[PDB]
Amino acid sequence: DRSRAFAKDVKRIVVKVGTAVVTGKGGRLALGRLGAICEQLAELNSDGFEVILVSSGAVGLGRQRLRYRQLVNSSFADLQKPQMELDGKACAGVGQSSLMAYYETMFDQLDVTVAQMLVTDSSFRDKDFRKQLSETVKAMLRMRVIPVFNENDAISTRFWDNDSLAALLSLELKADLLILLSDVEGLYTGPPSDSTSKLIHTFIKEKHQDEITFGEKRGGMTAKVKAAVNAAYGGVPVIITSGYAAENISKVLRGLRVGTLFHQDAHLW
Amino acid sequence: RYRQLVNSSFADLQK
Amino acid sequence: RLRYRQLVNSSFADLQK
Amino acid sequence: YRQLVNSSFADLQKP
Ligand SMILES: Nc1ncnc2c1ncn2[C@@H]1O[C@H](COP(=O)(O)OP(=O)(O)OP(=O)(O)OC(=O)CC[C@@H](N)C(=O)O)[C@@H](O)[C@@H]1O
Numbered sequence: 001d002r003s004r005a006f007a008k009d010v011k012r013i014v015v016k017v018g019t020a021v022v023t024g025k026g027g028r029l030a031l032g033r034l035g036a037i038c039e040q041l042a043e044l045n046s047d048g049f050e051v052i053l054v055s056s057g058a059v060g061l062g063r064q065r066l067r068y069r070q071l072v073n074s075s076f077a078d079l080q081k082p083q084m085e086l087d088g089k090a091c092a093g094v095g096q097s098s099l100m101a102y103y104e105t106m107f108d109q110l111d112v113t114v115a116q117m118l119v120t121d122s123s124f125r126d127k128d129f130r131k132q133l134s135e136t137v138k139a140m141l142r143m144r145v146i147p148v149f150n151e152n153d154a155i156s157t158r159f160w161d162n163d164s165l166a167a168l169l170s171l172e173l174k175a176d177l178l179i180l181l182s183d184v185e186g187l188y189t190g191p192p193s194d195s196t197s198k199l200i201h202t203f204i205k206e207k208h209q210d211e212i213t214f215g216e217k218r219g220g221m222t223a224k225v226k227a228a229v230n231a232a233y234g235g236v237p238v239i240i241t242s243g244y245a246a247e248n249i250s251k252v253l254r255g256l257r258v259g260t261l262f263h264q265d266a267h268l269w
Numbered sequence: 270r271y272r273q274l275v276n277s278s279f280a281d282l283q284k
Numbered sequence: 285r286l287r288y289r290q291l292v293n294s295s296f297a298d299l300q301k
Numbered sequence: 302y303r304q305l306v307n308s309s310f311a312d313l314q315k316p
């Protein structure tokens with residue numbers, strides 16, 4: 001169809017993986033999903049694309065790691081006592097290292113180099129930063145590398161989510177497609193549990209904005225949508241699709257109808 | 270809870 | 285390693301025994 | 302047993 005017609009001209013891609021995709025049951029890494037996504041990204045990078053990956057899920061992985069360590073270091077007497085909460089910043093600082101080590105190992109198995117770029121909120125207001133980041137990203141992509149962006153949570157003092165960061169980077173680096181990998185198959189007219197909700201294949205701002213009732217479950221579908229609209233009307237089309245399927249990325253890149261599209265040229269389609 | 274813990278194992282204190 | 289696994293699974297009572 | 306109830310699991314690992 002005319003909707004998925006820009007896919008053949010796609011050259012630079014920004015892919016975001018949520019917490020519901022990176023970390024599965026028990027707070028541990030979801031090895032199957034992450035491996036499939038990494039294999040798809042390596043195939044894409046070998047086929048001539050510039051892939052940018054914006055990861056997440058460091059908080060949960062670090063929280064699980066610190067809970068084990070706390071259990072190991074504790075005392076039977078204390079195990080009895082309700083154990084206190086763990087600091088969120090400490091959990092993020094622990095989990096980022098493990099997540100990046102896993103990413104490096106998986107991409108080394110496939111012979112792909114990765115780079116870790118950590119940017120906070122205060123950095124995006126400097127005049128020079130928005131210029132130097134573009135040059136660094138371009139230099140990395142020219143050399144066939146996959147930058148792995150995230151929000152440095154250990155340092156940051158705190159709307160901005162990981163999805164807003166993804167939209168921001170899509171705008172700045174002039175990407176040509178933005179894919180949001182989440183748990184649900186895509187944006188629905190209502191909560192996915194209800195049987196009266198159907199998968200929308202095109203988000204027209206003057207038709208679905210008022211007819212969509214968001215539920216709940218860093219940000220639900222009330223913030224993914226905001227970031228998607230922001231990125232799309234800045235000029236970068238947006239695709240939302242489930243991260244469970246491994247082959248959704250390639251099917252999107254082949255022009256097949258997958259997920260919901262945020263495109264500015266949806267006024268007349 | 271005491272007897273429970275005395276019976277449980279470290280891994281069991283997990284989850 | 286095997287020792288670690290054994291501890292991780294041993295019941296406090298067994299550590300007693 | 303008092304030692305065993307006040308020990309930390311790691312401690313059990315070290316003789
Ligand atoms: N109308 C609807 N249609 C479809 N689905 C809907 C709808 N209404 C509700 N839902 C449900 O909405 C949920 C959204 O999922 P969600 O909120 O869990 O988003 P998700 O991507 O998984 O996590 P995140 O990226 O936001 O977390 C981070 O950014 C971490 C940042 C970083 N510092 C780190 O700590 O790593 C879906 O699941 C459910 O269908």
Ligand SMILES: [Mg+2]
Nearest residue numbers: 161218219220
């Ligand atoms: Mg969110």
